[PDB]
């Protein structure tokens, strides 16, 4: 017996990266998983390095980031790589989740990897939110203030919880130092959950774009998907290069180059772009607690896709109506993103409410109805 199979440690690596039996027809949308692993590796390498030069104390934090930019050899690169890769991480994660929804990757027997995946997504949001605060610029401070004040909506104990989270009566030094410690930790937790969702997946194997079994026709992960992953790695690195070296501040907010000032409020307080759709959903509900619930529900509702999809067929490749509905759902999600950064003004207030209703009605009404009707059309249409 080959050593890679005989030795228990080598055999674990073997089972995931080499002999792992894959469908022979995975398309390029199956490459986002390895891009997410790449983003995670970049964030760990750059993040640990930034931590060697960063000071978490509020009197020194912003200045330590300027020290990184100006004095540390290649500090500018490490900082810009870390900041831009956070954005790329969300592009890849949305693409990965989009793939999963389009191709029915959430259906049995893959409910568990999908459900762990939803938690990974929440952990990424928390990770990125805390990392953004560490700069301690104007957007850092005011973003932290507004977002942490949402916890005040928890009935009875909310206010007490906020003061507990802050370690004081407003966002300050105690908050920054604890966000540093937790920002360092959370990526390790995220790596563990990423590993867990892959172990859960390994019982059924990868799905494929046709939605059928691949047990009939398997291909080794290596060399086929190893070399196919390299193409998207280099495409990713080209995109990375264009942002990091030629336009490093395109995705950021200029106000985060102003040191945090609790007195002066910035003109507009918006989250980073990748949180904007959830911010639009929150704004749509007039009630404070209502808004918070809706915002959380917008993510947790992903957990019910296995139930509300009533199709007897996995994925959308052969479902014209479900493909149209998916297209509208995705574009609506992008419009929500845009509406998250407009001013609270007519006519965007009502538009945000309509888009929020559409977002939820996809899960609760449209997908159950469309999937039921398509079942009937497949049966009658082929009689």
């Amino acid at each position: 017996m080959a050593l890679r199979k005989k030795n228990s440690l080598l055999n674990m690596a073997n089972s995931y990266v080499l002999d792992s039996p894959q469908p022979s027809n995975l398309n390029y949308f199956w490459n986002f998983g390895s891009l997410l692993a790449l983003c995670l590796v970049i964030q760990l390498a750059t993040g640990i390095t930034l931590a060697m030069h960063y000071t978490s104390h509020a009197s020194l934090a912003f200045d330590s980031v300027e020290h990184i930019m100006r004095d540390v050899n290649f500090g500018w690169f490490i900082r810009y790589a870390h900041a831009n890769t956070a954005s790329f991480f969300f592009i890849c994660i949305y693409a990965h989740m989009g793939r999963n929804i389009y191709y029915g990757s959430y259906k049995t027997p893959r409910v568990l990897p999908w459900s762990i995946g939803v938690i990974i997504f929440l952990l990424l949001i928390i990770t990125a939110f805390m990392g953004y605060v560490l700069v301690f610029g104007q957007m850092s401070l005011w973003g932290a203030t507004v977002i942490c004040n949402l916890v005040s909506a928890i009935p009875w104990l909310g206010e007490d919880i906020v003061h507990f989270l802050w370690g004081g009566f407003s966002v300050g030094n105690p908050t920054l130092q604890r966000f540093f410690a937790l920002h360092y930790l959370m990526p390790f937790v995220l790596a563990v959950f990423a590993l867990l969702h892959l172990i859960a997946l390994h019982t059924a194997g990868s799905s494929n774009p046709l939605g059928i079994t691949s047990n009939v026709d398997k291909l080794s992960m290596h060399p086929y998907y190893s070399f196919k992953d390299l193409i998207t790695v280099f495409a990713f690195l080209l995109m990375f290069t264009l942002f990091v070296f030629f336009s490093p501040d395109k995705l950021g907010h200029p106000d985060n180059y102003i040191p945090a000032n609790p007195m002066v409020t910035p003109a507009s307080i918006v989250p980073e772009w990748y949180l904007l759709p959830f911010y639009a959903i929150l704004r749509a509900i007039p009630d404070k607690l209502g808004g918070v619930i809706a915002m959380v529900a917008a993510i947790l509702i992903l957990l019910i896709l296995p139930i509300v999809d009533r199709s007897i067929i996995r994925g959308n490749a052969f479902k014209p109506i479900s493909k149209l509905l998916f297209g509208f759902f995705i574009c609506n999600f992008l419009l929500l993103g845009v509406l998250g950064q407009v001013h609270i003004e007519p006519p965007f207030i009502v538009l945000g409410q309509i888009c929020t209703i559409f977002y939820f009605s996809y899960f609760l009404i449209l997908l159950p109805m469309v999937s039921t009707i398509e079942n009937i059309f497949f049966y009658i249409g082929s009689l």
Binding site: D19, P21, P109, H202, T203, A204, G205, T213, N215, V216, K218, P320, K323, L324, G327, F328, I330, C331, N332, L334, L335, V338, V342, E345, P346, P347, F348, L351
Partner: protein, 85 residues
């Protein structure tokens, strides 16, 4: 629902003969020009409507909303803005 090599969980297979040639024996870019033009055109044409319809609808909606918002905050839009608030 998945086994491993030798017992993958396929129904019994019989009667299929599979053939292929070595990567060293093949031209990897055989028919690339035909594929790049004709295959891509076929592939794109068949999916075009599923992208065009939602993109064009949501872009139209955005365009109308952003133009109205802009107009409401001009001098000319003063009265309509007062009603809207």
């Amino acid at each position: 629902y998945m086994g491993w090599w030798g017992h993958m969980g396929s129904p019994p297979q019989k009667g299929i003969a599979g053939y292929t040639i070595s990567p060293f024996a093949a031209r990897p870019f055989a028919g690339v020009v035909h594929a790049a033009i004709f295959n891509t055109f076929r592939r794109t044409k068949n999916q075009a409507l599923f992208v065009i319809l939602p993109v064009s609808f949501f872009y139209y909606v955005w365009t109308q909303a952003s133009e109205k918002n802009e107009w409401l905050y001009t001098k000319a839009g003063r009265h309509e803005l007062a009603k809207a608030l």
